[PDB]
Amino acid sequence: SNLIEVFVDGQSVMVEPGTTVLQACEKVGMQIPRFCYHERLSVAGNCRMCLVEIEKAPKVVAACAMPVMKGWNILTNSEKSKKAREGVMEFLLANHPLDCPICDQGGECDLQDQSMMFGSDRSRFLEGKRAVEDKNIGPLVKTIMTRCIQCTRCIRFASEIAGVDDLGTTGRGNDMQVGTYIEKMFMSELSGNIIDICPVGALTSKPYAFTARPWETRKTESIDVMDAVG
Amino acid sequence: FDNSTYRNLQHHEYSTYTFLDLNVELSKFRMPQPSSGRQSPRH
Amino acid sequence: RFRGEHALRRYPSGEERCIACKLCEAVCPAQAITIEAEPRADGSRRTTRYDIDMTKCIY
Amino acid sequence: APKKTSFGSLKDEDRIFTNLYGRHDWRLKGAQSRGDWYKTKEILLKGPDWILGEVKTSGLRGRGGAGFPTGLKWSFMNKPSDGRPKYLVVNADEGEPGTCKDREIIRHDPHKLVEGCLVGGRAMGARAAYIYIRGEFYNEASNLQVAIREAYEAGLIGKNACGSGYDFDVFVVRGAGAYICGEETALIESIEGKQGKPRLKPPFPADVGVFGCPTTVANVETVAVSPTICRRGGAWFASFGRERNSGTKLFNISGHVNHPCTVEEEMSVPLKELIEKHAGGVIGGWDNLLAVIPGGSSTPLIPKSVCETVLMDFDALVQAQTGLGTAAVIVMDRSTDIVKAIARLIEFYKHESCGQCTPCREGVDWMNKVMARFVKGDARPAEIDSLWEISKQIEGHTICALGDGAAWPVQGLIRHFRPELEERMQQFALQHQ
Amino acid sequence: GAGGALFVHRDTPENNPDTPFDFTPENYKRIEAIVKNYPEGHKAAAVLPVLDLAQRQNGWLPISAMNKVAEILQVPPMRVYEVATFYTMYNRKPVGKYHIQVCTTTPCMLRNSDSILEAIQKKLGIKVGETTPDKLFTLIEVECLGACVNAPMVQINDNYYEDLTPKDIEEIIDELKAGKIPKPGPRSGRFSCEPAGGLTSLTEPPKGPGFGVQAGL
Numbered sequence A: 001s002n003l004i005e006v007f008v009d010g011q012s013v014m015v016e017p018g019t020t021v022l023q024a025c026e027k028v029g030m031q032i033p034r035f036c037y038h039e040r041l042s043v044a045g046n047c048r049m050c051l052v053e054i055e056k057a058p059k060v061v062a063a064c065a066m067p068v069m070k071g072w073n074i075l076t077n078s079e080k081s082k083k084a085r086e087g088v089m090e091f092l093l094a095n096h097p098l099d100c101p102i103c104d105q106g107g108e109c110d111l112q113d114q115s116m117m118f119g120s121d122r123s124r125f126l127e128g129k130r131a132v133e134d135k136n137i138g139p140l141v142k143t144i145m146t147r148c149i150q151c152t153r154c155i156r157f158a159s160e161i162a163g164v165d166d167l168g169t170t171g172r173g174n175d176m177q178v179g180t181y182i183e184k185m186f187m188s189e190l191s192g193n194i195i196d197i198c199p200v201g202a203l204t205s206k207p208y209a210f211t212a213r214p215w216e217t218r219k220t221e222s223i224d225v226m227d228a229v230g
Numbered sequence B: 001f002d003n004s005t006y007r008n009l010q011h012h013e014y015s016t017y018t019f020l021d022l023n024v025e026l027s028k029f030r031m032p033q034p035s036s037g038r039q040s041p042r043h
Numbered sequence C: 001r002f003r004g005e006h007a008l009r010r011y012p013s014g015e016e017r018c019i020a021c022k023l024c025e026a027v028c029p030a031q032a033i034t035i036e037a038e039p040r041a042d043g044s045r046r047t048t049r050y051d052i053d054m055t056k057c058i059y
Numbered sequence D: 001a002p003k004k005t006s007f008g009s010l011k012d013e014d015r016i017f018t019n020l021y022g023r024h025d026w027r028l029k030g031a032q033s034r035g036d037w038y039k040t041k042e043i044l045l046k047g048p049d050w051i052l053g054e055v056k057t058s059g060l061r062g063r064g065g066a067g068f069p070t071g072l073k074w075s076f077m078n079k080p081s082d083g084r085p086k087y088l089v090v091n092a093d094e095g096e097p098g099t100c101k102d103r104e105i106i107r108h109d110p111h112k113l114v115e116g117c118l119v120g121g122r123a124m125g126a127r128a129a130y131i132y133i134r135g136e137f138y139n140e141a142s143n144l145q146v147a148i149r150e151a152y153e154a155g156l157i158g159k160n161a162c163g164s165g166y167d168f169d170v171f172v173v174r175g176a177g178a179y180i181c182g183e184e185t186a187l188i189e190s191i192e193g194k195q196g197k198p199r200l201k202p203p204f205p206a207d208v209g210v211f212g213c214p215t216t217v218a219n220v221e222t223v224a225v226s227p228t229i230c231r232r233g234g235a236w237f238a239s240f241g242r243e244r245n246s247g248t249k250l251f252n253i254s255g256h257v258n259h260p261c262t263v264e265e266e267m268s269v270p271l272k273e274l275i276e277k278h279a280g281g282v283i284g285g286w287d288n289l290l291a292v293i294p295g296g297s298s299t300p301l302i303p304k305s306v307c308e309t310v311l312m313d314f315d316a317l318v319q320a321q322t323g324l325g326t327a328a329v330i331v332m333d334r335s336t337d338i339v340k341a342i343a344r345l346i347e348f349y350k351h352e353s354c355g356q357c358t359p360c361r362e363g364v365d366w367m368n369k370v371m372a373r374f375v376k377g378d379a380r381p382a383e384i385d386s387l388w389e390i391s392k393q394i395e396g397h398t399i400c401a402l403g404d405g406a407a408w409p410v411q412g413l414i415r416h417f418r419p420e421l422e423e424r425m426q427q428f429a430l431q432h433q
Numbered sequence E: 001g002a003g004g005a006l007f008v009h010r011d012t013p014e015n016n017p018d019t020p021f022d023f024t025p026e027n028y029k030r031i032e033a034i035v036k037n038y039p040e041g042h043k044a045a046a047v048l049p050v051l052d053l054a055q056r057q058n059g060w061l062p063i064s065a066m067n068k069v070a071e072i073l074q075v076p077p078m079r080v081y082e083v084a085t086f087y088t089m090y091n092r093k094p095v096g097k098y099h100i101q102v103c104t105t106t107p108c109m110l111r112n113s114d115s116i117l118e119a120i121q122k123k124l125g126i127k128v129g130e131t132t133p134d135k136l137f138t139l140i141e142v143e144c145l146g147a148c149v150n151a152p153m154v155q156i157n158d159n160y161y162e163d164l165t166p167k168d169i170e171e172i173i174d175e176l177k178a179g180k181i182p183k184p185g186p187r188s189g190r191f192s193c194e195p196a197g198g199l200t201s202l203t204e205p206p207k208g209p210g211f212g213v214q215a216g217l
């Protein structure tokens, strides 16, 4: 066949060429930590949370953007991968605001969950945090940019899925801000999905604000009747 | 043959449009550009 | 340290301290707390309902 | 006798850049008297394989700072055509603090660069060369444009190059103030009209470069010599410096020296000999030396005790734990606040980070704040090891090497001048109770 | 220190979409020549030179100029905003007639650049982020300008003035505000990157063409 053999933690897996390390890892039930990778969006590689160790390689690789080579042995739980994850989460949480009680992403945060599973439990950041002014993109989506981790998922979704090129980044370095640079309404028939794709409370639902927490809700699977798509 | 002089003195009289004027002048020497097949990636 | 009748506190300015995070509701072993919230008229995150059933509470 | 053991004294007949000081006409007529554009038609007619072999046996390594072997890098692009045009991009961003070598080449020997672009593009089969120059070098860019106009007028480049029947164009592109645009992928993205943010590798530019076509990115210094190596032999070039450290190098000596200058010298020259001969020695005598950053701000610094016998090449400086880099020597005597100098370098790196990836974007600002507090002594000795580990987290986890270049000076300062940090901390502690 | 400037746009009578900006016909010829260099099917590669041309024509980059550049090259205005805010050579706010950059990175910091900066400050009476009341000088600090060997140096409107002293920079300033324009280059009798005195290398006349050419070619 065309499949090639790769090893995830010493276990043989057969995968099609061009398959990334993340997909090869998930073919055995291992989910690599991620913040900027979405499987329905183009690869970014900016977050750096997906860094894993390949055996016999001194450098850790971005599992979300690196195709597996023939005979590679991935090491998803070695000391190097764990230290990389802890460092990346330390950097992510360095400037994050202490907003979890007032954040609507409270029990639904990938930042929170992956900090509990892959990060450290302490902080050694002894400086002042950064603060970003809010941007108004319309009634449907509430914006609290301080919480943004600069994943850029929203920009890719707007550019590709929604066909609207209004979202971007201005500035560079620590002071880099996601927005429109002008007072503009991000209007689209699919504009509400940037709330779901955003892993943090930077983009949240405005009608839903403050009304509930995820652990209270009871989930009912149903069908939409507002159009004929179903 | 001398070395007491400085020969790179033409840049003392360059204006703000020197580079673009030179680009315009060189426009008539370049080979035709290759085409992607579309007018833009958004086409 | 004595635990006695419950009370909701304020900030020195007179603003309520509670921000409707619902951590008290999630931790209550007896499920004695019920909370509802919404944005206030000024946009503040404040409760609209905060009940404690003291015949359910284990103090 | 073969197998030389001492290096650092080459006379003018073996210097590639014979107009480094702009003392001869830089115009085509003056450059041709210096041997520029001589037998180009024959070199092109030899073939890409001959030029690639000449570069390979020459032992040349990348002069941008990484020191990658130029032969294999340029032969990576020797693939057959697949429908996409092939391009050459010459890196003239010139962003490293302390470095000034490429500016002199562009402003004083531009025809060397143009001919190097032609020869390298023929070697790689490139259709055209894009020269990405720093946006601040407006006079240098216009001089390069004048040189390109002269080359077009004489039929040296363009349709039917000198006599080879090989079409090749040389464009000049100006950036707008971004040191990150010296990264080859960031430079490529900047040419395509986006933010100067680096791409991930793989793919490499030899597969997906500018406009999504195979591209090779080379330094101006690396590219300019190419013509000379082909002519004078290549095996002549390997006769200079140690093994795997071949050739001639341009050095930028700045800081606390009597006469700062840009000079050309053999690769494996010792640092002390270079400083004493060309720079005129350290201010106040060699005994007044405190620390030196050998290859620009991106490399760790070394104390005076290491500068006594160190060789100015890639491998010897690697053994001294600093690396060669761009061969820009910044000299610091005993009258400088070394912590302040390293903090200023870290602030530079903070103001130049593009912000794309998490480790650089937050960790560099974190180190900047920590070093700002270190300068005043407003910290405690455990923060030294904390900063060391922060730098370690940043290094090797970033997309491009700007995080590496921000972490390395911090590690060098911690490694060599920890007692200075502790003295400052205790002084601030007892001064403020 | 910090950026100081903001990366969001708020409308203003001096800067709004209706603010009049357009390219001169000569500048349209220049834009055509710029666009021609890049491959057909790729025109967004011309945003940098066209935006720089707009800034050169106008003196700064209003929101209308960004929108015009986006319209001409048929790209989303957000991408032009990204380019304009990313690069520090673009002025999204009016500057003085003579915009002064003083390099303060470590190689220039070692050669007493702070003296140059304070001499400029007390000559003009403004700080490092202000413009003179007559709108003729704007003073800022920048990173390494690539003139480190000749440092301490400052760059003015595409010109380099190296090997400076407080007296030299004051002479440059008062010669510039009189209506003249000082000649660029070092002010230490060096006029190049050569060693301060002696010219330790390249003393011999340059060799003739084909002097070291190898055999067989």
Ligand SMILES: NC(=O)C1=CN([C@@H]2O[C@H](COP(=O)(O)OP(=O)(O)OC[C@H]3O[C@@H](n4cnc5c(N)ncnc54)[C@H](O)[C@@H]3O)[C@@H](O)[C@H]2O)C=CC1
Pocket: D062, D063, D064, D065, D066, D067, D068, D073, D076, D093, D094, D095, D096, D097, D099, D182, D184, D204, D205, D217, D298, D325, D326, D400, D401, D405
């Ligand atoms: N001259 C200047 O102003 C500055 C120079 N630098 C220097 O840049 C150096 C680091 O730059 P990098 O490009 O990230 O170093 P690198 O080691 O990643 O690669 C350098 C060159 O080798 C090529 N290359 C490397 N591995 C390859 C592979 N497996 N296949 C094909 N090609 C490969 C790359 O395409 C690139 O052109 C630093 O050492 C620094 O000193 C840094 C800042 C400024």
Ligand SMILES: Cc1cc2nc3c(=O)[nH]c(=O)nc-3n(C[C@H](O)[C@H](O)[C@H](O)COP(=O)(O)O)c2cc1C
Pocket: D061, D062, D063, D064, D065, D066, D067, D068, D091, D092, D093, D094, D095, D096, D179, D180, D181, D182, D183, D184, D217, D218, D219, D220, D222, D400, D401, D402, D405
């Ligand atoms: C942050 C950063 C800045 C850089 N700046 C430059 C530069 O200004 N000039 C340069 O030639 N290379 C620069 N480089 C490295 C380039 O990749 C290098 O020039 C390119 O690989 C050409 O290598 P060569 O000289 O071996 O051909 C930089 C790298 C990084 C990470």
Ligand code: SF4
Pocket: A096, A097, A098, A099, A100, A101, A103, A104, A105, A106, A107, A109, A111, A112, A147, A199, A200, A201, A202
């Ligand atoms: S986004 Fe997540 S981590 Fe950040 S404040 Fe909200 S709940 Fe906390």
Ligand code: SF4
Pocket: A147, A148, A149, A150, A151, A152, A153, A154, A155, A178, A197, A198, A199, A200, A202, A203
């Ligand atoms: S707003 Fe959310 S989705 Fe958009 S860049 Fe920030 S964290 Fe990512």
Ligand code: SF4
Pocket: A101, C017, C018, C019, C020, C021, C022, C023, C024, C025, C035
């Ligand atoms: S909801 Fe409960 S835990 Fe949260 S602020 Fe109010 S009283 Fe405190």
Ligand code: SF4
Pocket: D180, D197, D198, D352, D353, D354, D355, D356, D357, D358, D360, D361, D398, D399, D400, D401, D402, D403
């Ligand atoms: S290391 Fe810094 S400059 Fe390089 S890609 Fe990451 S954020 Fe950008």
Ligand code: FES
Pocket: A033, A034, A035, A036, A037, A044, A045, A046, A047, A048, A049, A050, A051, A062, A063, A064, A065
């Ligand atoms: S998930 Fe791979 S770098 Fe973000």
Ligand code: FES
Pocket: D097, D098, E103, E104, E105, E106, E107, E108, E109, E143, E144, E145, E146, E147, E148, E149, E151, E153
């Ligand atoms: S340090 Fe001033 S020009 Fe580079």
Ligand SMILES: [Mg+2]
Pocket: A105, A194, A195, A196, A197, A198, A199, A200, A201, A202, A203, A204
């Ligand atoms: Mg969200």
